[PDB]
Amino acid sequence: MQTLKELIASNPDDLTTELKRAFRPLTPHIAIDGNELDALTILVNLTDKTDDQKDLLDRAKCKQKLRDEKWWASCINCVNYRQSHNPKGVIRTQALGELPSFLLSSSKIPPYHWSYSHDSKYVNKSAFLTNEFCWDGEISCLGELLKDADHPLWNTLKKLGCSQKTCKAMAKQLADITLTTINVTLAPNYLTQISLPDSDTSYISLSPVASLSMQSHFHQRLQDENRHSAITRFSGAFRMLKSGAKFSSPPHHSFLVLPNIRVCGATALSSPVTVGIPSLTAFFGFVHAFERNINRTTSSFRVESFAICVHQLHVEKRGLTAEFVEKGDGTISAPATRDDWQCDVVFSLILNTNFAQHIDQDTLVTSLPKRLARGSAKIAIDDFKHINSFSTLETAIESLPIEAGRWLSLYAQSNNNLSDLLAAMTEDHQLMASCVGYHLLEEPKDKPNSLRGYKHAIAECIIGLINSITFSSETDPNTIFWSLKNYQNYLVVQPRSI
């Protein structure tokens, strides 16, 4: 399905630097099918000097540059950097594996909108080879096309100006750009490592990255949808999903019950393209930090699942002032405020522990992690009396102090694209999207520097829809009880059922 929007439909209107908008990502593609190849690569060439000397559609000014092999080399070195994922190194891959229907990562979205991401000295020179566009229906960039050396794109660039030798020189040089690459050293602690358990006997340290093909896909589709959009400034105002409206709390009617964990400033921004409850891997990091905390005294705790009951959830765009520390040569100052979303989620937990023994309060309230997702998870002091381990699930859910809440469970219907995810969220009001899992991009190998020395695997967020289930007697507990399951290629926190 393509309404192409060729430039013939965009040349006549106000071409002045509405072309740069057209060829830049986050703005839909432009068709150069067979229409104006020669004239529409002139502009791809003249977008190389993106400063006040810019007035495109000039065959003279473009063949000025296409004859320069210094500019040619300075631009073809840029195609080496068209990262498919931005850490917030060079990482462009296809997110090895394949998720189920109900989960959504970049492996569902087609692989385009891969923008050059490197030093800001050649961001304008990046425009020639690292700009994508659709033609023949194939949506590619001049880094992929001009490799095979025998494209009509090549012979039209010949029409435009060259030495008839760069057609093969630059072609063989483009052949060397290693179309799939993950090369990012992480000893400078730049890649926000986390560690998640895998195979119950080891851990894999992930370093999540932001899917570029999926931050461009959630950004254009969320234009006309303004209930489900939460613009983050990123000072480049990306957009991201939301809940339908405010989180309402209807009643929700061994087993270790945490009665009312209240989080204060957890990051609502679950995935780089989602603003809702914190990621379930964050909830799972919480409950497995709890398990590991108790493992210091009772070395066979082993929580195998947990049931989250979100009583209250309040997403808000607070400031999160930057750090005043600027160890530069001059004075110190404070950078701008990143404009980070934060949720204040009061939630409960019902850990399906394999430990039917007295686990008395003083070691329960201690050895209880003090942060959910950069938040301050705290059980009230008088809610310490409700930390009780029951045998059956019914009386455990009966025993939760607050009644108005919702149980969290995946939404098993298809989630191929955002269009499939919005059309499921405009019918289901408070169905909330959240980072649930991690789609790996590498085979987890032992990297030089890693969090806690485990193997390292650069992953990306897996967004899944998250339901509400009022716990009636005819309810499957395997749907309420989440658990982290490690498939070879992606690593998800999905309900015991699904």
């Binding site: 400078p188 204060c264 400033g265 808000e316 765009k317 400031g319 005043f324 520390v325 110190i332």
Partner: protein, 337 residues
Amino acid sequence: LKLPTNLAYERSIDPSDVCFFVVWPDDRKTPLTYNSRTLLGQMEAASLAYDVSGQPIKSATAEALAQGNPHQVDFCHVPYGASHIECSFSVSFSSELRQPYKCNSSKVKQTLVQLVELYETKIGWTELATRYLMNICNGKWLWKNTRKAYCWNIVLTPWPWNGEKVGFEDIRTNYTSRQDFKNNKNWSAIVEMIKTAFSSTDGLAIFEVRATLHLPTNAMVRPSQVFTNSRVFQSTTIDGERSPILGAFKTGAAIATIDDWYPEATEPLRVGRFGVHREDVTCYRHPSTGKDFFSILQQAEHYIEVLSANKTPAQETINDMHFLMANLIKGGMFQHK
């Protein structure tokens, strides 16, 4: 000391949001509410009528400075019949400053885990614990709300606690100094609970603090703003309705405003690598002087040796030792990449 490529500390003090409830005379609590008024202000700015280099803008005539400009501000105020305002939060002290959360060189890890021990034994935790606790027991997390208030009382419920609730009545008049806090019947048992929480390798001290604050009629409550409306209050949802809050980081910055050990001490600063003053925008403990946290962290070995001696160290070195330990309690990524 050479700083390793990464040296982070999980924060010891862990505060929560300061939630505001209105306590009515029939003693039912209802969370405060804030509504966004719109104001017709004047043309007060100097940017409106004065050009760069102090020369009046000649387009900004008297007719033009007349027109008021619209400013949307969030007004939050004690309701009319409200008996008082109850400001509740909870802070957990823990011993997350013993070992660094992360480090790559086992030399600097050892020289800091030994440094914290030498500090604890030589110059007891009773000096940082007392200063962290005085900001909790006198309403200091109530940043500006206590400014214009008849009276505010701090009741306080520690978790690892057997006795009764510990109260501080009329902090404006009774508890005005450190000695007036020591005279409390429970003060010793609480400063020692904090200094234990910092000592025991996996112990913590949870305080639920609750300040009954008697604002005058219709008095304006001042919760934390958000960076730009014109005054956006940072809020949460309590009992299903949105209520303004003093954020968790604002309160953690209130508790850690203990650092007066900087050159030419005037009044306490919030602990940080460079003593930065939001009041007077410039920053004390600049790296120019030898009081920036990195400069006194590079001297951690010398502090080890000056504490290991049998003779008590100087006061000026014990102040830098205090600031070092307080900056460690604050946590953070003490690195240089």
